[PDB]
């Protein structure tokens, strides 16, 4: 031991991640003629709690009949889930929304149904995300979207107003330029630009307003509008292969799972 401790017992590793592949496959019977000693146990001992359970004679389940494994995070959360939606009402306006992992921020100003469930299953998130925005409404509208890391100057979140920034400051952060007649969709990465190791969701105090947000996406539109037509944007998040997840955590209860 490096720390100078001593013990006569054995210390074992508790709750090892990923103990089994969640597809039916083969890595005779499962239980058999031998008497099941794993039926009776002591749960207060972490060594005896790792014993394989059996009580009844069984046999092997066989193999499944679909190729993919739906119980993996990189395939479950590879599906792009809903993030936010908002509408514009006037000309030359600017809207700003952060991607906050915190569970204190309730929707509409926070993570909705499935993303609120997922980012409170674990402690630490580190890596780039994957944003898709969808344009619904007017046509011949020129818009520009850019990405600001946390700790830098930007307009007020969740408020649609005129922009107090200049065009030299917007285009220096990296921006895209679209038109609502040609595309109707933008599939854009979001870089991992932070000064800290990883961001977390389940925090309070001044750690909730610092270590929860990691990035911040804002959109400005021009050439809107003519007489009577609405313009609506909707955002969707997916996860990438460069991202990582650490330290599993107790899931949210049935009163914190909220939606829009």
């Amino acid at each position: 031991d490096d720390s100078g401790g001593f013990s006569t017992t054995v210390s074992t590793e508790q709750n090892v991640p990923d103990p089994q592949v969640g597809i039916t496959t083969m890595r005779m019977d499962v239980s058999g003629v031998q008497a099941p000693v794993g039926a009776i146990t002591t749960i207060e001992d972490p060594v005896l709690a790792k014993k394989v359970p059996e009580t009844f004679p069984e046999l092997k389940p066989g193999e499944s009949r679909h190729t993919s494994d739906h119980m993996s995070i990189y395939k479950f959360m590879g599906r792009s889930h809903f993030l936010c939606t908002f509408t514009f009402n006037s000309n030359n306006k600017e809207y700003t929304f952060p991607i906050t992992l915190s569970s204190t921020s309730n929707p509409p100003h926070g993570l909705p149904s499935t993303l609120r469930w997922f980012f409170n299953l674990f402690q630490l998130y580190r890596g780039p995300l994957d944003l898709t925005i969808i344009i619904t409404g007017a046509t011949d509208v020129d818009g520009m979207a850019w990405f600001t890391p946390v700790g830098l100057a930007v307009d007020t979140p969740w408020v649609e107003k005129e922009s107090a920034l200049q065009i030299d400051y917007k285009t220096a952060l990296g921006a895209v330029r679209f038109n609502t007649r040609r595309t109707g969709n933008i599939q854009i990465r979001l870089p991992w630009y932070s000064y800290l190791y990883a961001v977390s969701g389940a925090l309070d105090g001044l750690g909730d307003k610092t270590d929860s947000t990691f990035g911040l996406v804002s959109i400005q539109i021009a050439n809107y509008n003519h007489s009577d037509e609405y313009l609506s944007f909707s955002c969707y998040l997916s996860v990438t292969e460069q991202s990582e997840f650490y330290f599993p955590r107790a899931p949210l209860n049935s009163n914190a799972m909220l939606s829009t």
């Binding site: 100078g4 309070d204 107790a250």
Partner: protein
């Protein structure tokens, strides 16, 4: 031709953080040397960081009663803030350094008579006891205290934090948070003691210390 040596002008001395550049220097004058003791006045090992920082300290004493209902919270304590106190020997290392990176060893002890019955859970929750489920506290590094089976549980955890180190003078948020919930109620008969005492021991493991500072 003979050479007359003179005293050296420039030299750099110090002990690993104090650097003294001298325009007028001289050699060191040392008498004697380091001697061992053939008849030692102290037979223990001498003091270091290991025997002063990595040592169990009593941080909390609660008491579990028969009137606490199910899922009542017997102890809710920040582990690292309680070790940052003058009464412990680890303060002398932490008062002068700025950042640290450490592991935590917890030992929780109770003492029932065998006429009592009940249970407890002792989970290590990082950061915050957030909106998660009380019935899912066995996902964390935990330990179950049953009045029939055992009376000591012990937990060992690594460093889990959103930054690279922990700042004692002005922390962001607590690193670890120990909770002790009533997992099954304490029941007695007539005349049996309606209480049991509880104690929590804590110590650092693998303590790293960075940036010694004058201001506390």
């Amino acid at each position: 031709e003979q050479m007359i040596q003179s005293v050296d002008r420039t030299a750099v001395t110090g002990a690993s953080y104090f650097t003294s550049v001298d325009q007028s220097s001289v050699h060191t004058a040392e008498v004697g040397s380091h001697q061992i003791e053939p008849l030692k006045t102290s037979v223990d090992k001498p003091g270091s960081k290991k025997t002063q920082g990595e040592k169990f300290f009593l941080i909390h004493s609660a008491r579990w009663l028969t009137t606490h209902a199910l899922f009542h919270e017997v102890a809710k304590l920040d582990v690292v803030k309680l070790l940052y106190n003058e009464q412990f020997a680890v303060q002398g290392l932490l008062r002068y350094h700025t950042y640290a990176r450490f592991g935590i060893e917890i030992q929780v002890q109770i003492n029932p008579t065998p006429f009592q019955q009940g249970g407890l859970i002792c989970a290590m929750v990082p950061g915050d006891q957030s909106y998660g489920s009380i019935a899912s506290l066995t996902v964390y590094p935990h330990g179950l205290l049953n009045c029939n089976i055992n009376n000591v549980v012990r937990i060992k955890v690594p460093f889990i934090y959103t930054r690279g180190a922990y700042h004692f003078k002005d922390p962001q948020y607590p690193v670890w948070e120990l909770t002790i919930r009533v997992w099954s109620e304490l029941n007695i008969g007539t005349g049996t003691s309606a209480y049991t005492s509880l104690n929590v021991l804590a110590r650092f493991t693998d303590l790293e210390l960075h940036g010694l500072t004058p201001l506390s």
